[PDB]
Write a protein that binds this ligand. Structure first.
Ligand SMILES: CCCCCCCC/C=C\CCCCCCCC(=O)O[C@@H](COC(=O)CCCCCCCCCCCCCCC)COP(=O)([O-])OCC[N+](C)(C)C
Ligand SMILES: CCCCCCCC/C=C\CCCCCCCC(=O)O[C@@H](COC(=O)CCCCCCCCCCCCCCC)COP(=O)([O-])OCC[N+](C)(C)C
Ligand SMILES: CCCCCCCC/C=C\CCCCCCCC(=O)O[C@@H](COC(=O)CCCCCCCCCCCCCCC)COP(=O)([O-])OCC[N+](C)(C)C
Ligand SMILES: CCCCCCCC/C=C\CCCCCCCC(=O)O[C@@H](COC(=O)CCCCCCCCCCCCCCC)COP(=O)([O-])OCC[N+](C)(C)C
Ligand SMILES: CCCCCCCC/C=C\CCCCCCCC(=O)O[C@@H](COC(=O)CCCCCCCCCCCCCCC)COP(=O)([O-])OCC[N+](C)(C)C
Ligand SMILES: CCCCCCCC/C=C\CCCCCCCC(=O)O[C@@H](COC(=O)CCCCCCCCCCCCCCC)COP(=O)([O-])OCC[N+](C)(C)C
Ligand SMILES: CCCCCCCC/C=C\CCCCCCCC(=O)O[C@@H](COC(=O)CCCCCCCCCCCCCCC)COP(=O)([O-])OCC[N+](C)(C)C
Ligand SMILES: CCCCCCCC/C=C\CCCCCCCC(=O)O[C@@H](COC(=O)CCCCCCCCCCCCCCC)COP(=O)([O-])OCC[N+](C)(C)C
Ligand SMILES: [K+]
Ligand SMILES: [K+]
Ligand SMILES: [K+]
Ligand SMILES: [K+]
Lengths: 223, 223, 223, 223
């Protein structure tokens, strides 16, 4: 009865309109999540979150009754609804952590969108390449964060006060973001940074064409 | 009679020279558009814009009489001529908006150039990929603009005063531009930015090879 | 007699050693060109440049006598020797211009190196793509330098005082260098910059795979 | 006897567990290397390095007795153990140089990891491309570091005081890192930088697809 309505968006006009509200409520909740942090708004933002939560719970229980937890879609629905009920029952770090989780509302759009599902499949099918990329980046960062520290220990006015403190700079230079908050001053540090830029470029460039190929294959096969 | 002259640049020497003036007037109008904003120039810039407008109107009406509005080329011609007649007839935001539209003179070069037409066709044939890229970038930005805000709410001297205020930073880091006007200060914010750089690199890298392939196909087929 | 010695580096051991001095003198001249500008050195740098010039003139005249000007290699040799004789015969802008030309000594290494010759051939065979890239970059820069100026004319403390003054910023953002000396301040300027980054990324990405393919073809065919 | 245990990680459960300690000790030594530079720690860090050194010496001598130096793996083991014995026997520049070498502990993970071995093989098989890339980058840097100096010698407040001093800026701009500590001020310097950005982009882009192809071939053949 309701399973066809909530699982066949193209079966009938009654089911087609339902998905529109399903997307509108998600977008409204996402919008209202960001506006609570604006200083100008330091009651109206709670009576609408309550309706959004009620709609999410109804949408979950309708498909829960008419059968489940082995797929990723149902897991996301449960996570999106938990944080509201926790704060109704009732350390600041725990409060910030449970407030941050609310951001997982954006992942409920994956049931409607197809490109996001393709991206998820591509991410699932390319774990080894991502691990290799992280490994190479860590090796390069730890290799380049010590040379720049040892090549500028003579100067009393150097930003790099320790090897860990030079980690940030390294990941800034290898990714070519270049914020510029920390820069080498001596000649040897400049040579180290010049080598670091090229090494980071090559390290980032090497793994990507495999993930790109997997995404292209999935996108072309699905569409 | 005049249709062959104004639509066959290689038919005769009389038609070939006409296109030269057609390009020279466009370039002169583009040049004169920028120089009105220089502080040194705070009359000479109006009596030449009038001649440019007269030439544009003549060029439009010659092909309008000898036949139309279903193509994009004729639409651009109408837009390029409207703003002059509006200000002759006679709120500051409306004035700035109608002054900004004048910049559409540069698109009249598409009738003469071929690579710009190829670029337009490629843009037309790859709407879905551009939409997917924008979707992925928005998802990543909204995902990373809240973690960095929640990981630095303890510090009283943090730049990120709200989740929307951290949008800019995010799009600066994911695109690897790295202006450096806003940077994370705490350890957790630095970890968030380190993850954000890689995520933005991958997100930007994934969609492009399809638009690149479409442009290559169009460029090779046309030329 | 001398033509075989000066044109067959692998014919004999006598000719093989000659090229070593030919490279050493070029490298020494390049090194001595940069060190004259160091503040510490504000006579020794002239008596060695004289010997370098004498060797260049001898190397030119040996192959000039035993035959010519239709190739690019002989043109570079003449340019490298002219600036010394001009200053011996005897407005500050002309002096700086004729002093800057001396930097063309580095191009004499193209006769010995092969990868540089391959790069030159690739550059010669891909003029149209470079022109198209420059055209697209100019169009994007002129398009984005006016919107950011018109979207921030209200603020009295904006860096962008004119449309030309916003050219620099634009080419900084489209190339993703991001120096950070000029940044948008208002919301609309930030949106304009966010669009500009993506537009520049796509514009730069589109033309390159043709020049890359030409270079790969030449490199694989030669080697 | 012990050769099978120390060279066949998958032969038996006794050999499988040994590699776990071999990785744990390496990771612990790497971690303890960085924490000595933290200002908070200005004895505990020596009695654990001693155990790490003892384990490394034992692991080396077990495979040394049961046979050698022609491979790269055995060379790395010797280098990792030398610096400890040098300081036990007993100019500040020599001390910093011999302290910096300790960072070579990270390369001992290559015996266990496979992707790092693939990366090493790819680096070995692509020496010519790396040399060509370095050559092109040096040519571009020396070409662009003199034009920007000669185009801004008129201004008394220019950062570029000499041609060598402008090397850093150049390698910052060609790699698109853009720290922003040194920027051109005059119009001509800005034009030079605008050309430099594009030239560096093309120069970096040209060599890479060969190293990428070699890495892809090795990764697909091995796995
Ligand atoms: C960051 C920016 C955005 C990143 C990521 C945003 C993407 C969020 C998840 C994508 C939607 C989930 C989804 O559609 O499930 C599908 C994927 O099939 C799977 O089971 C894989 C699960 C998702 C992969 C998560 C790995 C994250 C690794 C670390 C990645 C970091 C299955 O659908 P079905 O089989 O059709 O039923
Ligand atoms: C792949 C690596 C990606 C990214 C690696 C870069 C990590 C973020 C850099 C933060 C620097 C930092 O924390 O400075 C505060 C000092 O350092 C500390 O006191 C604790 C830092 C431990 C973080 C270790 C992460 C892996 C680094 C190894
Ligand atoms: C920004 C930098 C420059 C970007 C863009 C600069 C390019 C401006 C337009 C290109 C010239 C227009 C043109 O030649 O029409 C042709 C394209 O055929 C079409 O009908 C497509 C219309 C143009 C696509 C605009 C989509 C913009 C999407 C959002 C894009 C953002 C038809 O010609 P014909 O068929 O031969 O007759
Ligand atoms: C794809 C996203 C591309 C780009 C997304 C980045 C948008 C530009 C960032 C501007 C930040 C800003 O406006 O700060 C002023 C505060 O914010 C506000 O008061 C209003 C901002 C609303 C803009 C929403 C755009 C989509 C963001 C979601
Ligand atoms: C900037 C970084 C370095 C850029 C460039 C550094 C490269 C300098 C020139 C390369 C060496 C010249 C050369 O070897 O001639 C060969 C090329 O055949 C030609 O005739 C093409 C001439 C050189 C192309 C110059 C176009 C510059 C366009 C604008 C480019 C900007 C012929 O040799 P042969 O046929 O074997 O006899
Ligand atoms: C491809 C474009 C590449 C690069 C285009 C970027 C050009 C460099 C930007 C310099 C900005 C500048 O000069 O500011 C001083 C004000 O402007 C002037 O007074 C004169 C500037 C005229 C330069 C016109 C070049 C093409 C710009 C159109
Ligand atoms: C910087 C970031 C990280 C860069 C580099 C980190 C990688 C460090 C070395 C890789 C592990 C070494 C190795 O596994 O040997 C294998 C490679 O076969 C060789 O003999 C090549 C030797 C290593 C190449 C070093 C060239 C460095 C050039 C300059 C490069 C700069 C042989 O193993 P096997 O044949 O199976 O026995
Ligand atoms: C490939 C080139 C890669 C990178 C080339 C960039 C090299 C790092 C730039 C350092 C600038 C510098 O040292 O300023 C102090 C002044 O200069 C000196 O007093 C000595 C500098 C000599 C370094 C020569 C290296 C090759 C430059 C030619
Ligand atoms: K950058
Ligand atoms: K960059
Ligand atoms: K930057
Ligand atoms: K910067």
């Amino acid at each position: 009865k309701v399973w066809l309505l909530f699982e066949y968006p193209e079966s009938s006009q009654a089911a087609r309109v339902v998905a529109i509200i399903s997307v509108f409520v998600i977008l409204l909740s996402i919008v209202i999540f960001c506006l609570e942090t604006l200083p100008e708004f330091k009651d109206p933002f709670f009576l609408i979150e309550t309706l959004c939560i009620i709609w999410f719970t109804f949408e979950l229980t309708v498909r829960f009754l008419a059968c489940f937890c082995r797929d990723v879609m149902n897991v996301i629905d449960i996570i999106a609804i938990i944080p509201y009920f926790i704060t109704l029952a009732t350390s600041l770090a725990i409060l910030r952590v449970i407030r941050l989780v609310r951001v997982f509302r954006i992942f409920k759009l994956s049931r409607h969108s197809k490109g996001l599902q393709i991206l998820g499949r591509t991410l699932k099918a390319s774990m080894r390449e991502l691990g290799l990329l992280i490994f190479f980046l860590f090796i390069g960062v730890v290799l380049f964060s010590s040379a720049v520290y040892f090549a500028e220990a003579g100067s009393e006015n150097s930003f790099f006060k320790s090897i860990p403190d030079a980690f940030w700079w390294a990941v800034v230079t290898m990714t070519t973001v270049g914020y510029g908050d920390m820069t080498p001053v001596g000649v040897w540090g400049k040579i180290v940074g010049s080598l670091c830029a090229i090494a980071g470029v090559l390290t980032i460039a090497l793994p990507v064409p495999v993930i790109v190929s997997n995404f292209n294959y999935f996108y072309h096969r699905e569409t």
